Symmetry: none
Subunit: 162 residues, 7 copies
């Protein structure tokens, strides 16, 4: 086994490295397979992404919302913008992080429309208002996970779990 | 690429395991080497049964028109219902395959982006696309001819009004 | 690469189709394909002398001396070969289509067919005229002039030219 | 990729180039490299062990190859006691034509659209003199005719090759 | 592959350079090994010429998040981030083979990241920050008999 | 292709030693030889030789391994066997040395260079049963020899003439 | 592969140059073979023109960390680091084939490294250090039956 295959057999999906149309092809292909294995047993997603193609990240995020399984989503290492979206899109209550991860939400006229979609989906998952997200997404800063938990991306920060 | 091992001890490429759910992924550009590969999958799945629907997941920015029409023709010749899902984006030929799914079961996801914009043989080829859009979208040729001229993406809830989609799904019932 | 399973290299789809007697010739017909399709066809003959072989053609062109190697193997084999045109059938890809068993040369309705193409290359081009005149029943002067024009033609024309027996949007 | 065809025994898998050995079909196709010569030498000597007298069918489609590689194949065709039937499909050019000519007499065949061509230091001169002698043995042409014909760089049709004596029948269908 | 066949014995070979691909691959393994038990140690054999600080810190924090005793063996070489992972092994169980060679030596955000390295070396080596800040400027390998007294590793060992 | 065929032939205990002998080849033939011993201590192994020569320090690595292995090793000369290629032919198990009738054989090629030459004379005298002076009297002459001469000289036992 | 089948026989091949890439792979095979059996010998066949010293010392230390008897067979040539690994096999079963060629001959940091090699030859060959000083200077290969008297070998064998 490759370790990602040995993890997949226990319903843990890894999205690590940059997100692109090929990585999306793999992460969608796993996600909807683990639905056919069971419609109840939660799926775990581990995030370690320096960014990605915006229309690939929305392909993964839409699939995560389409699937009926609870998806417990773990920030491991860093979650730059297009990973931070997926981290936020975990099932509410099971968006975990390591203690010293690095989280950042900052990154044609159609691109402006697409950016406007990101503000809406952050507003749904973080419960912040649109102006808070629009202003917060302007700054190139890695927020620490204890701050990201207060912004609303994370439900808890884990150290020394059972 | 992940593998999964069934209890013999067959090890499946994750796409080959999904093929057992009759799921065909077509993601990334359509070209002579993906149309060759998706037609082979389609012709295989028709052999395992004539009745059971095939689910086709599209995420492609476009592709070679004479390859996209090879997949489309195979989707018509086959007797299976082909549920078509447009996860991510579908642009140009990627939107044709989405139009070509079985009427009533062409699905899409709300944050997808759909677009139908693209010798004399290029003109005589272009006039094929207008006819098959007029067949599957039920729009008139003049509407397709104008709608294929504007370089924009349309949101999936617009495309359902244009008739490319049957339904836009969240938390499926 | 291709969807695979370990057999217990890997058991790809193009092999997993071969059990159903389906031969794909897709992409260009070169010496590496031609030396391969004539290996598949010979294997399918010994599994059954009578059961048809289905051959799906999507070729934008090919090496003339490779396309004639596949073509003559298709005549040597006793099996009825049913040739399906899906997408391109241009240059040698249209010969293999025309070489399918009389009555079972099929095309899907949006495929584009084209027959257009030292001394040895001229007499070899003259060999193409003879085999097109054999299968299409057009006279040599009609073939020699129809190969002169650089156009694709719709498969409704290809029936009138005689390359196809039937176009099929949906199977009977 | 060569089709890996799977056959029930547990499961086992054979390349079609090896699955054909169930019917004693030896495909020599593409250029005759040292590796391709190594395969067909091993493959021919194996078939003699399964039966001493049942025919072998060899299908030739070669544009040419290394002179000392094709002679390595040709010598096994002379050592082996099996009748070998040689089918030329596509083209048999340069040393690929020797293998066609070396099939057992009366059962050298080629398909009507084929192309045949016999044309291609003291050790190299003596090697080429060996080729003329073996062509004179198998084609029954006199040495001067082969020495003159083997310098001409043209293909010949299978109907010309039949009267030149490289092959014994041109056949559309097996019957 | 042998690197996965070793995994059955809870051995993590972190060998070659540390990069974002390899850092992902080791924190995949560590988190898997923590699922199979919370109790049994993990053995980590380090042979790294160096690595990307943004990746060597990803491995390191998983080694602190995991409760398993991680026993780190320096085999051959441990330089730059490879030296941190050796230092981050569980106190008392950091080991080095006698011929291995160790080196700690290698826009404001990059200086803040460098300041984070000084704090974690001070936590695990117990040296004061002014010692590590100076010592990290010396482009010089230290032998295991020096690294033991500098505090990176606890014992040099053959035939345990 | 070429490096696939050699793998296919391992399934029938045939070892191709082809092209010039160098450390990139000798480190592979001795690896195959040791593998094919472990599959059976008594099943024969077939060397297929088609090599024009090479570096002596690689060809002696194969030769020593062919003496260490307990299997009977058949040596088939196919194509040509010159220099080190002819040594590996001679080193086959007595009675198992075969050659194709028009294959071409050649034995001809600091104080260490003399010492390297002197050990070649010893191993040729061992396997050919010719006296060392008879080896020198032949090995100084640069010619190819026919297998029917090599048989009577004693490099090989059988020519595949029938 | 061949080498990953030989791993089933407890046979390890050090073939070609000993670089950091292959050292990272013989250490993995060695540490794996210890886990399958702590007692059954490992046979290591050496054919190395040489190598980078900071990789040959990584294989060598792993050969000392492992408790298995390691039988080192010199096949072809063992020059430079290849000769160290040959000398490192467990006393009494370092073996050589009769035509193989053995050679031990190969700044402040380079001197401080090279003084390791003299000590780790000296204690394995039972030679006085001043002999290695004048034996490692001559650029010559030496015959196996000379290397046996110099102490690099235990047996020269035609057949096992």
């Amino acid at each position: 086994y490759d370790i990602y295959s040995r993890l997949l057999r226990e319903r843990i999906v890894c999205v690590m490295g940059p997100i692109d149309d090929s990585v999306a092809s793999l992460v969608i292909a796993q996600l909807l397979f683990l639905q056919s294995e069971s419609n109840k047993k939660p799926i775990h997603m581990y995030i370690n992404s320096p960014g990605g193609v915006v229309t690939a990240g929305l392909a993964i995020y839409d699939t995560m919302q389409y699937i009926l399984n609870p998806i417990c989503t773990w920030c491991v290492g860093q979650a730059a913008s297009m990973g931070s979206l997926l981290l936020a899109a975990g099932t509410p209550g099971m968006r975990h992080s390591l203690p010293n991860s690095r989280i950042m939400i900052h990154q044609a006229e159609e691109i402006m429309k697409l950016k406007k979609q990101l503000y809406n989906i952050y507003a749904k998952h973080t419960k912040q208002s649109l102006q808070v997200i629009e202003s917060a997404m302007e700054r190139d800063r890695y927020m620490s996970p204890m701050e990201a938990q207060e912004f609303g991306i994370l439900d808890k920060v884990l150290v020394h779990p059972p």
